[PDB]
Design a protein around this ligand. Structure first.
Ligand SMILES: C#CCCCCCCCCCCCC(=O)SCCNC(=O)CCNC(=O)[C@H](O)C(C)(C)COP(=O)(O)OP(=O)(O)OC[C@H]1O[C@@H](n2cnc3c(N)ncnc32)[C@H](O)[C@@H]1OP(=O)(O)O
Ligand SMILES: Cc1nn(C)c(C)c1NS(=O)(=O)c1c(Cl)cc(-c2ccnc(N3CCNCC3)c2)cc1Cl
Ligand SMILES: [Cl-]
Length: 385
């Protein structure tokens, strides 16, 4: 590929590799005063729109755009179906900016046909903490693909982020772009076996009959960590200490304030599930996973695959395998069909014994305007939504 757009940007070329001692911007000494004050030009008939995600109607417009036009698997069987409540949660973290929730409307219909978003986060990369933007939910309507709208959305959000004196970003994508700092495969743990077979997500053979498959993935309805319970407001301080200490071992992680811990972990039904083990008023273990269904395209019986995604999990009183076994159980108790995880942090070590199957795609982690050594995904300590 030529990367005609990306090679104009402060990112590594596809052949670039850096020593572990290199950890710095491509372009330093940036000046807010020099940032373009004009919005990037859109093709005739299209206009920028600042979305208010706290307004139900604006939020529903984003929801519809993404439901119909967002990420599909390579075989066009599944399309992500982020809920409206999920989008509210994902986009209104502490110190979010409404003007970083950017839509594009088709003037004649007044309909939203494009979107991109950013939220601010402090990112520790190779022990250096940098104020960054986390870019997500880039989407162009299926009818307008391959018209070079995505670089316009990227350049416009870059401009708006730069106006706030932020010059680095973090982002993930399934597509290969210049140039990942890490690459993490997805793994899947079947919960509702029969449904997964019926929709083609899983397979049988003459050895693995339907009944044998169901027995293989059967789980005992008893927690290894008996007191694991839904997180409450009183647990924010203890989760902040437990998770904050845990994440410092990694090469890439978010540095969460107490306010960010409250936002990202306090439970919201059908959005975010966090469980804690409290001993003597101290949080000693935590499990968390978020809800992200996929629409099943075309299937007669089922419209929705109900998937839980591993978020952040820490144990100090059990083994990591016991903890993730409880995570699977808690997902099953909340009626999820499958439990998905990336090979980040310590996750890969438990996939075999807990009967995860390797998927067929990976998530690439990227930094914008930052050069550093790449690393194996066990050194990644951040999960983006
Ligand atoms: C400081 C501060 C800096 C802030 C900025 C940091 C950089 C942020 C980059 C964006 C990160 C996005 C993270 C994600 O949210 S992930 C989910 C992506 N959402 C989907 O997968 C939904 C379904 N899909 C679509 O909605 C469209 O396919 C897209 C993704 C909008 C792409 O639009 P289309 O019509 O194909 O392509 P056009 O408009 O002709 O643009 C082509 C150029 O674009 C590049 N590109 C494509 N996908 C990308 C992508 N996902 N992220 C970034 N760049 C992408 C591509 O390579 C090429 O450029 P070159 O010529 O190769 O240099
Ligand atoms: C079962 C299923 N349902 N769907 C809808 C799909 C795609 C699958 N197959 S999958 O599990 O193997 C999978 C998964 Cl989960 C995710 C991605 C992917 C692609 C691009 N971008 C992201 N980002 C997520 C983080 N924020 C930025 C966007 C994820 C690709 C694959 Cl292929
Ligand atoms: Cl129990």
């Amino acid at each position: 590929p030529d990367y005609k757009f990306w090679y104009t940007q402060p990112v590594p070329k596809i052949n670039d590799e850096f020593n572990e001692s290199v950890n710095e911007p491509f372009i330093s000494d940036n000046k807010v005063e020099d940032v373009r004050k004009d919005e990037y030009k859109l093709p005739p008939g299209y206009s920028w729109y600042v979305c208010d995600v706290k307004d139900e109607k604006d939020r529903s417009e984003i929801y519809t755009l993404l439901t119909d036009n967002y990420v599909e698997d390579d075989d066009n069987i599944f399309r992500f179906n982020y809920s409206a409540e999920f989008l509210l949660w994902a986009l209104t973290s502490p110190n979010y900016l409404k003007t970083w929730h950017i839509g594009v409307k088709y003037d004649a219909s007044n309909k939203l046909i494009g979107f991109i978003s950013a939220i601010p986060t402090d990112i520790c990369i190779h022990k250096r903490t940098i104020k960054m933007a986390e870019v997500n939910f880039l989407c162009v309507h299926k009818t307008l693909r391959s018209k070079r709208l995505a670089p316009v959305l990227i350049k416009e959000i870059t401009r708006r982020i730069n106006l706030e004196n932020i010059w680095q970003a973090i982002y993930t994508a399934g597509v290969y772009l210049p140039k990942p700092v890490s690459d993490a495969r997805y793994y899947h743990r079947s919960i509702n076996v029969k449904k997964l077979i019926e929709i083609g997500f899983s397979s049988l053979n003459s050895r693995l009959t339907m009944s044998r498959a169901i027995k293989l993935y059967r789980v005992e309805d008893t927690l290894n960590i008996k007191n694991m319970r839904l997180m409450k407001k009183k647990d924010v301080e203890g989760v902040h200490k437990l998770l904050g200490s845990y994440l410092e071992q990694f090469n890439l992680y978010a540095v969460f304030t107490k306010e960010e811990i409250a936002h990202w972990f306090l439970p919201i039904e059908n959005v975010i599930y966090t469980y804690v083990n409290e001993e003597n008023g101290k949080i000693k273990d935590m499990i968390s996973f978020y809800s992200l269904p996929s629409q099943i395209l075309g299937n007669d019986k089922y419209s929705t695959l109900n998937a839980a995604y591993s978020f952040y999990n820490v144990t100090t009183t059990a083994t990591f395998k016991q903890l993730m076994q409880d995570a699977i159980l808690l997902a099953k108790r909340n009626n999820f069909d499958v439990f998905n995880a990336l090979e980040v942090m310590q996750n890969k070590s438990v996939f075999e014994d807990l009967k995860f199957g390797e998927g067929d795609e990976s998530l690439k982690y990227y930094l914008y305007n930052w050069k550093c050594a790449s690393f194996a995904p066990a050194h990644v300590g951040i999960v983006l939504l």
